[PDB]
Structure formats: C-alpha cells, structure tokens
Design a protein around this ligand. Structure first.
Ligand SMILES: NC(=O)C1=CN([C@@H]2O[C@H](COP(=O)(O)OP(=O)(O)OC[C@H]3O[C@@H](n4cnc5c(N)ncnc54)[C@H](O)[C@@H]3OP(=O)(O)O)[C@@H](O)[C@H]2O)C=CC1
Ligand SMILES: NC(=O)C1=CN([C@@H]2O[C@H](COP(=O)(O)OP(=O)(O)OC[C@H]3O[C@@H](n4cnc5c(N)ncnc54)[C@H](O)[C@@H]3OP(=O)(O)O)[C@@H](O)[C@H]2O)C=CC1
Ligand SMILES: NC(=O)C1=CN([C@@H]2O[C@H](COP(=O)(O)OP(=O)(O)OC[C@H]3O[C@@H](n4cnc5c(N)ncnc54)[C@H](O)[C@@H]3OP(=O)(O)O)[C@@H](O)[C@H]2O)C=CC1
Ligand SMILES: NC(=O)C1=CN([C@@H]2O[C@H](COP(=O)(O)OP(=O)(O)OC[C@H]3O[C@@H](n4cnc5c(N)ncnc54)[C@H](O)[C@@H]3OP(=O)(O)O)[C@@H](O)[C@H]2O)C=CC1
Ligand SMILES: Cc1c(CN(C)C(=O)CCc2cnc3c(c2)CCC(=O)N3)oc2ccccc12
Ligand SMILES: Cc1c(CN(C)C(=O)CCc2cnc3c(c2)CCC(=O)N3)oc2ccccc12
Ligand SMILES: Cc1c(CN(C)C(=O)CCc2cnc3c(c2)CCC(=O)N3)oc2ccccc12
Ligand SMILES: Cc1c(CN(C)C(=O)CCc2cnc3c(c2)CCC(=O)N3)oc2ccccc12
Lengths: 256, 256, 256, 256
C-alpha cells in the first residue's frame, strides 16, 4: 500500500515552491512516483524545471498547456501519452479570476470576468478529465483543489466562490460519468495557505489568524498536509471513495 | 401580512401556462401584487400577453430582455423603473443548456456548451440583481429557481447540474453583498415538474415516478406549490431569511 | 391564503414574553388562529395565563405536560382533543441540558447529562408527533426549533449541539414516516436571541455581536421573525415542503 | 509514511470475520501496527481470539468492555495503558438499536429504545474518547463508523438514523474539544456491507442492488476498502483533517 514506485501522475498548476501542487509533488515523489508537470506559458518553464530538480526525478517531464485552449489540452495529453505512456492520475490545482473581481462588490461582476473564472477554474477540469481518461484505460484517480468559499459566501472571494462551487459540482458529475471506467474524481478543500494566489489579497493575515484562533487544531495547514491527503486520494487507499470533497483545514469546515 | 396589494414584482422566465414562474405569477396575483413580465424574443410577446390576461391585471407590463445581453438587461430594468417605478422584488426562472449536453457523457461537454449554461443559468442572476437593485432603494427580495441536480449528480442533468451549483453559490454571494442594502436573495429548489423544460428529456416520467414512490409526501409538487413558497420568500414573512435554498419537492431532498 | 381563522395550533415551550415560541404565538394569533399552550410545571401556569391574556384569545387553553413523562404527553394531547377537537399543527420549542454541560469540555460530558439532553430536546418531538397525529386525521404541520450548533461545532454549545443534530435528523425521519398521513415536519434554525435560554451563557453578547458584524443582513433576528417563518411552515403556503430546516438568522448559515 | 510498525491502535466492535472493524484490523495489521481489541461479553472472547490469530499478532491483547458501563470503559482503558502503554488511536465500530425499532414506523419509537440507541451508538464515543485521551498524551486519532442514514432519512433505519446523526455531531464536538490536545476525531460513512448488523434487516439485498445500479463506481464496497480509509485517518497522512466524515461508498453520497 502507498508504494507509488510504478505509478505516474500529471500535476497541473505548480507556480513556485509555495504552490499547493508542489506540496503534492513532494509527497508523491517521496512515495516513489514518476511525475509529469504542466505550465501555462513558456516564460515559466525554466524556473519550473529548476524548482523540480529539487525532487531529483531521473527525467524532467514538462509540458506547456494553457487550459483555455482545447488544442493545447488535447495535444498536451496526447504528447504525454506518447512520451511516458499511460498514467495513474492527475492533480489539478488551477484557478484564476481577474484581481478586480476579488475585491469588488460581487454584484458588480462583469460577464467576461464571471465566465473567465468559470472557464479556467471549472471547465478546465472537465476537458482535462476527458483527455486524461485516454491515458487511463485501466482506470485512475483525478483530484482537484477547492476552498470553503465554494460552499459558503466568504468576504471578497466573490467570483472565485462561484467558480469553486461550479468546480465542486464538476467533480461530482465527472465522478458519476467516469466511475464505470474505474476513474475516481475527488476534491481537496484546502484551508488558506500563503502562496502566490494570496498575493494582493487584502486581509490575508487576518484569514490565517482566524483559523489559528478558531479551527479545532488551532493552527493553519500547509502544502505538504494537502499533499499527504492527495496521495491517499490518488492511490488505491481511497479505492471506494469518489465525488468526495475532503477538508484539509485543521477542522475549520466543522465549526461555526 | 401577505397582503401584496401595494407591491410590484418582476417575473422572468414565463414561457407558457405550465411554467413554474406562471405558478409564481398566479399566487402573487391572487395576493394582490402588480406584476411585470420579461421574455426573451419578440416572437413570444403575443402568446405571453394572452396567457397573462388570465390574471386580469389592470395593466399589461411586458419587456423584451435577453439576459445574454448586458444592454438589454440594463435598458430593460431602466425602462421598468420609468414605467412602473420602484419594485419590491424579482422572481428569476431562467435556465438553458444545449440539448446535446443534457444526454451526453458529461465529460464530453464542449467549452462553449459549458459557458453557455453558466451565462444564461447563473450569470444572468448577477446582472439582473445589480440592475434590479437600482429599483429597490428601500430594499426588496430576489428569488431564483434551482433543482436538486445542483447539489448532487443526477443522471443526464450534466452541464445544468454544474450551472445550478453555480447559481446556488451566486445566490449566497449576492445575499452577502446585498444584505446591507436590505435586499434578500434566496433560491427555491423545485422538484421535477412537467413543463416546457422537460421536453425532450428522456425518462422524465421515470423521474416523476421515483418522487411519487420515495418522497415523504408520496406525490409530486406543482407550480402553484412553488409559487406559494415564492410568495413567502418575496414578502416580509421571510424577513430574517437570506442566502437560503428552500426545497419544494415533497421532502425528496431529505431522503436517500 | 394565510387566513388562520379556523385553525388551531398547540404551542409548546413558552416560558415568558421573550420566548421564541411567544413570537410564534403572536404571529399565529394575529393571523386569527386559536391557540393551545403547554407548560412543564404547575408553578408556571399563572404567569403563562397572564402573559397569554396579551393575545386576547376568547378562551385560555393551557395544559401541564412534562415531555419527560409518556403518561403526561399521551394524557395531555388526549385532553386537548376532548376540549378543543382536532388541531392543525404543533410548534415545538423545548430544549434542555444541565448548565454544567454548556461550559465544559464536551469530552467530559456525563452519560446522564448526554441522555437528559437527548430525552428533552430530541425524543420529545417523536412522542409529541405520535400523540399529536391522533388529533390530525386529515393532516397537519409540525415545526421544531433548532440552532446552527446542530450543524457545526459551536464553542460551549456542547451536549446541546449533539441534541440539536439528533432533533434535526428526528425531523427528517418523522417527515418520512408521517408524510403519507399528510403531516409535514420541519425545523426552524433560529439565530441567537436573548431569551431565558441565554441566561448564564457566557459570551452571549459576543455571539450577538458576531452576527451583527458578519451575517448578510448585518443585524440579529427576533422572535417575531421566527414566528413569521413558523406561520409559513404551519400553514398551507408550505404545502410541498417537509423535512426541511429553514434558517431565520440574517443569512449567517450561508457565510464563513 | 504509512509504516505503522511502532504504533498501537485499539479497535472496538469486531464481532466476526465480516465486521467492518475486522477489515480495519487487517489493513492496520498489514501496515505493521500492534492491535488491541475490545468486546462486549465474555461469551465472545474465544471466537474473537481465534478470529484474531489470523493476523498472527505476536501478542493477543483483548479486553471486555461494555460501553454501557462507565466503570468498564474507564477500567478497560486504564488496564490497556498498564499492559501496552500509550496508544496512537481508536477505531470505534459500535452501534445498537432494538430490532423492533428498525422496522417500525419511526413515530412509534419508545423512549427507552430511542435512548438505548443514543447511549450505545453515540454517547459511547464520548466516554471512549475521554478515557482514550489519557493514553494519548502526545496526540492521536479517533475514528468512528457511520452510515448515510445519519444524513438523510433512509427507510427502516429509523432510530439508528437519529443515533448516527448524533454520532456525526459527536465527532465534530469532540474534534473541537480535543484538537488542542492534537487528537483528531473523524468518521467514515461506509456504504452498506453484508455483516452481522445486516441480519434480520429486510430488503438488504435491495439496498445492495441500488448501490450497484446507481452509485458512480457501479459496485458495492467492502470492509477492506473501509479499512484502507481508516488507515489514512488513523495515520499522519491525515494530519490536517479533523471533524470530517469521509464517504467510502462507491460515490453513492454524491448522487440523487
Ligand atoms: N492559496 C490558498 O489559500 C488556497 C488555494 N486553493 C486553490 O488551490 C489551487 C492552487 O493554488 P495555489 O495557491 O497553489 O496557486 P499558485 O501557486 O498561484 O499556482 C497557480 C497555477 O495555476 C496556473 N494557471 C492559472 N490560469 C491558468 C490557465 N489558463 N492555464 C493553465 N494554467 C493556469 C498558474 O499559471 C499556476 O501554475 P503554472 O505556473 O503551472 O501555470 C487553486 O485551484 C486555488 O483556488 C485552495 C485553498 C486555499
Ligand atoms: N421543470 C422542472 O422540472 C424544474 C425546473 N427548474 C428550473 O425552473 C426554472 C424555469 O423552468 P420551467 O420548467 O418553468 O421553464 P420554461 O417553462 O421552459 O421557461 C423557460 C424560460 O426561460 C427563458 N430563457 C431561456 N434562456 C433565456 C435567455 N438567454 N434570456 C432570457 N430568457 C431565457 C425562456 O425563454 C423561458 O421564458 P420566456 O418565454 O419568458 O423567455 C429554470 O431555472 C429551471 O432550471 C427547477 C426544478 C424543476
Ligand atoms: N435562545 C436562542 O438563542 C435560540 C434558541 N433556540 C431553541 O429554541 C427553543 C426555545 O428556546 P427559548 O430560547 O425560547 O427558550 P425559553 O424561552 O427558555 O423556553 C424554554 C421552554 O422549554 C420548556 N421545557 C424545558 N424542559 C422541558 C420538559 N422536560 N418538559 C416540558 N417543557 C420543557 C421550558 O419549561 C420552557 O417552556 P414552558 O415554560 O412552556 O415549560 C429551544 O428548542 C432552543 O434550543 C434556537 C435558536 C436560538
Ligand atoms: N453493516 C453495514 O451495512 C454498515 C454498518 N455501519 C456501522 O458500522 C459499525 C459496525 O458495523 P458491523 O456491521 O461491522 O457490526 P458487527 O459486525 O455486528 O459488530 C458489532 C459490534 O458492536 C458491538 N456492540 C454492540 N453494542 C455494544 C455495547 N453496548 N458495548 C460494547 N460493544 C457493543 C457488538 O457486540 C459487536 O462487537 P463485539 O463483538 O466486539 O462486542 C456500526 O457502527 C454500524 O452502525 C456503517 C455503514 C454500513
Ligand atoms: C483565501 C483566499 C484566496 C486563496 N484562494 C483560496 C484562491 O483560490 C485564490 C484564487 C485566485 C484566483 N485568481 C487570482 C488570485 C487568486 C490572486 C491573483 C490574481 O490576479 N488572480 O484568494 C482569496 C481572494 C479573496 C478572499 C479570500 C481569498
Ligand atoms: C429534472 C430535469 C429537467 C428539468 N429541469 C430541472 C431543468 O432545469 C431543465 C433545464 C433545461 C435547460 N435547457 C434545456 C432544457 C432544459 C430542455 C430543452 C433545451 O433545449 N434546453 O431537465 C433535465 C435534464 C436531464 C435530466 C433531468 C432533468
Ligand atoms: C446560542 C446559545 C444558546 C441558546 N440556544 C440556541 C439554546 O438552544 C439554549 C438551550 C439551553 C438548554 N438548556 C439550558 C440552557 C440553554 C441555559 C439554562 C439551563 O440551565 N439549561 O445556548 C448556548 C449555550 C452555549 C453556547 C451558545 C449558546
Ligand atoms: C443499511 C442498514 C443497516 C446496517 N447499518 C448501516 C447499521 O448501522 C446497522 C445497525 C444495527 C443496530 N442494531 C441492530 C442491528 C443493526 C440489527 C440487529 C439488532 O438486533 N440490532 O441496518 C439497517 C436497518 C434498517 C435499514 C437499513 C439498514
């Protein structure tokens, strides 16, 4: 159990050493997995290669995939299959909204900002799952990252809250559709973590303080803690579990 | 309480006599409310006028608003304010997805089909709320229609399930944003009803049969039953209630 | 709709003018309903009679029923049926735990304290429903009062939180069992209100302050607001609604 | 990660080879854990010893603890601490209701039957947690078994449904109370499994058939699958997770 030595996972959404998806990569790597990484723009390839040398993987497998492009997602997973073969799962950690939409009054959200968030943060999972399934003929596990703001209205989270609720339903619909193909689809609801996606978010230290003061474990979580739950979900330990959303958040989801 | 004689409501999404929104109109009308109706295309105006004569309203207030158009939503509510004055609330009953997306494997959903459903079925509430609030300077109530498929993966509901989950989160975010303006925003989760939106949906009679056999009240609900709950939500009876999703479904939501 | 003139409701759990159940009584009374009141101990009868003269009911119908006694519940509803006839519904607002259990560490709860809370705060609904149904041969509506602490762990609520979760499940099981008899069973999740049940609860003003600062309506709710939702639930306006838990809490349930 | 060689767990509620808790024991045992077993009555000791020889544990640690007795729970965990030392966690799989209460109309449930179910199926976790914490001075993990009938009204589950809702809230309150002591408390919501607790349950094969036909994985789960999720929850893989209820049910919780 949990020896991932002959398993291969595609990880999407690493930006830097603080990325939640890099906590996932470190844990899967320590368990022996072969890892494939995707990134949005060619400008990020070098820093990502360099970051990933930390894992000492025998081969650096990196692919430019902008999930806004059908062509890039299809072509990318096809190239992954040609280069590395079939895979055992996908870790999805991609989200975006225009910054102006993460501070406004939500009622002022533009149509374009709303659809943009849905496209990147929710639809991306659907097309990734369809293309990744082609590499998983004997089944596999797909995991997406979410936040409690998809379950409750959190101040400022605004359009991303609606995008995460969409993502969370996307996970259940994919679980239903792909279950017969022995592909499980689950989410991790991570507590707040200081990453690049916290940059420009006002009052972020106040959010971190509230968890510390109120959550059952009276502390915040980190990327490795999300990564350990991701290993469980990506592995056969979680074989009977699908369409689930596991909170890795020091118990915050359970209190009011 | 519940005398709606000096109140005005805008109702969006009546297609015909079987529309859920027409059950809402009949109940509000019987309570004495003045009603304003919107419709998508000019081709539908005459049948809608004719249908609405059944309510014997002293004045027929009807406006062409395609919620896919920012201009039409802004201009429409502005014209409503000029013609009838301030309003007390809005009933939103608008949803759409391409039919091909309501029978597929969900994983095969196109980007365009996904975003289309989000645009009409979820974003429409956001822009309607922003424009309607301009007519509600002393506050008001906004109600949207949803389905259990936004909370759970239901077979075939597919892209509409993700759109309804988005709508349901939209309701909570709007409730948070507009609460300080004394505007409440709530949803009704209606059980299945044979309307125009059931047309082409395979196995619809099987869905109706399952409710009859399994729901606590052992019967299906109707449009007037949704309308009675909509009156409660649109009126001051529900003054302490916002961001809520009330199931009008014979108890089906409560069983498994 | 909502003319309750030829309807009779039994209200259980009024202690004084601040009781949530008295907000319910005032609203139902203003709607024209005939009301029957129960109370635990004979010592409370006079103050309750006096309090209830405020409603100017043509007849004072009051019954001593300690819900810990099967005999008193059976005999009480039987006497109600003999004196007033069949009823249209029951409003249940009864809860108790030993004070020592509402401040402890929850893990230190005694077996006796735990079972006491379950007995009064949850089982009471089950036996009341069974005895009340005998007075509702053409159907009716039963409503119970709950708190968000039954859905989430709230500090200090402790054994009452477990008792309310039990009550909330009791409501769904009763809804399923009694639905075929056209008896609906629902809960109201009231926000915090300064009543006799807040007495001795440390930090209660802090709880009230958090709602004011964080809930969508940025204010606390009152007993009349709960009473207006109770009228909706007790009346035919809510005819398609059962096993539901409606939050009357300024939207607090919808945020995090 | 997940090497449980220097860890000790107490497992409560094994009846025979089909017990969910025995699936838990097999998985933890294969991971290298030392196991301690409890049982209700001395009559069961021999069959349990014999069953447990299958695990080839170097020492057979078995204790008679009837969770209805405060003395037996306190004395039992105290004896466990004296014999084996500190422990790393507890797996709780104990439930009971009178059979007459699992087929009735729920509204006919006796006070004694209701409280009995609460006592064994819910309060037992509270006292076990308080006594077990004494053996976990550096922290630990407590896991309880639940069923979807604690979240929704399932036909016939009746008083056990209310008992499981109570258990599920018990888990959140314990998580809050014990979090500062670095003790995590979580539940597993297992899908239906043919065990001794299915004996006498009418229509059990129909329940199993519905999962197979409707759940995302289109199959039922087994005791080992619950055991693998229990290993995750009992180990440090789940370090940021508490007050959670993980569904091991082929995705059934996610559909309607
Ligand atoms: N940071 C937090 O507090 C939490 C974040 N989350 C969620 O976790 C996920 C990842 O968050 P992060 O905080 O680790 O984000 P960050 O470190 O900024 O990584 C964002 C990645 O998302 C990528 N990304 C963003 N947009 C796109 C796109 N259109 N196509 C492809 N990738 C895109 C972004 O470029 C970048 O990856 P690449 O460098 O591989 O491209 C997101 O889904 C986020 O919503 C959940 C709970 C708490
Ligand atoms: N029928 C059912 O089983 C249930 C439906 N619902 C929901 O109820 C709402 C209304 O459903 P309905 O079943 O009454 O739908 P229907 O009678 O077909 O009315 C649809 C309306 O939605 C309108 N509509 C659709 N797309 C658009 C658009 N882009 N802009 C403006 N209006 C649009 C459509 O034209 C039409 O109204 P107008 O004739 O006023 O335009 C929808 O939100 C639907 O998702 C919920 C539970 C159960
Ligand atoms: N106060 C609050 O913040 C909230 C209370 N609630 C709930 O509302 C319900 C009523 O609360 P309250 O705050 O109005 O309580 P209070 O005004 O103290 O009334 C308590 C009643 O509950 C009665 N009661 C208590 N125990 C028993 C018993 N064993 N048998 C019969 N009645 C019992 C108590 O005596 C008394 O009524 P009578 O005077 O009619 O007997 C309770 O179920 C409570 O848990 C919910 C949300 C917020
Ligand atoms: N079987 C199923 O379909 C499911 C069961 N569950 C739950 O799983 C748990 C265990 O179920 P099981 O189906 O494995 O039950 P079974 O194999 O009959 O074991 C019951 C144990 O619970 C014990 N038990 C029962 N009552 C008591 C008591 N008062 N004190 C101490 N132990 C008690 C019973 O004796 C026996 O253990 P011991 O032989 O160690 O004593 C229960 O909490 C049950 O509610 C959840 C989902 C699906
Ligand atoms: C917590 C929390 C986060 C972290 N989190 C859970 C997120 O999901 C962040 C998602 C995100 C998506 N798009 C952008 C940004 C963040 C900032 C930079 C940018 O230009 N676009 O973001 C918030 C935004 C507002 C309020 C709270 C939060
Ligand atoms: C129930 C139920 C409904 C009713 N319902 C709750 C809905 O929300 C229907 C929404 C809907 C949206 N767009 C379209 C259609 C229906 C049919 C005609 C069309 O061209 N587009 O629709 C289903 C579709 C699949 C499965 C179940 C259901
Ligand atoms: C809010 C809130 C309440 C109000 N509420 C929702 C309740 O349900 C109160 C229930 C209650 C039950 N039994 C007793 C008392 C209160 C105080 C007096 C007594 O001797 N026993 O009580 C709390 C107790 C602790 C923490 C928060 C709260
Ligand atoms: C599923 C399912 C189960 C399995 N399950 C999840 C359970 O939790 C069973 C719990 C249980 C508790 N007490 C007793 C029994 C079973 C049968 C023997 C006895 O004398 N008492 O039990 C049901 C009972 C009715 C309906 C469905 C179910």
């Amino acid at each position: 159990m949990l020896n991932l030595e002959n398993k291969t996972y595609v990880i999407m959404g690493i930006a830097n050493k603080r990325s939640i998806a890099f906590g996932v990569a470190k844990v899967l790597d320590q368990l022996g997995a072969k890892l494939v990484f995707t990134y949005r723009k060619e400008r990020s390839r070098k820093e990502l290669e360099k970051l990933l040398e930390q894992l000492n993987q025998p081969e650096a497998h990196l692919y430019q995939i902008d999930v806004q492009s059908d062509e890039e997602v299809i072509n990318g997973f096809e190239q992954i299959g040609k280069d590395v073969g079939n895979i055992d799962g996908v870790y999805h950690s991609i989200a975006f909204a225009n910054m102006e939409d993460l501070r406004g009054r939500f009622s002022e959200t533009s149509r374009e900002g709303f659809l943009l968030a849905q496209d990147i943060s929710s639809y991306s999972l659907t097309i990734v799952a369809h293309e990744a399934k082609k590499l998983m003929p004997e089944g596999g596990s797909i995991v997406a990252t979410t936040y409690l703001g998809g379950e409750f209205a959190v101040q400022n989270y605004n359009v991303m809250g609606v995008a995460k609720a969409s993502l969370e339903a996307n996970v259940k619909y994919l679980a239903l559709d792909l279950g017969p193909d022995n592909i499980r689809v689950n989410a991790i609801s991570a507590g707040p973590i200081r990453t690049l996606s916290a940059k420009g978010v006002g009052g972020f230290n106040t959010i971190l303080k509230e968890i510390k003061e109120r959550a059952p474990l009276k502390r915040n979580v980190d990327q490795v803690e999300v990564g350990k739950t991701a290993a469980y979900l990506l592995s056969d330990l979680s074989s009977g579990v699908t369409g689930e959303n596991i909170h890795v958040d020091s118990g915050f989801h359970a209190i009011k």
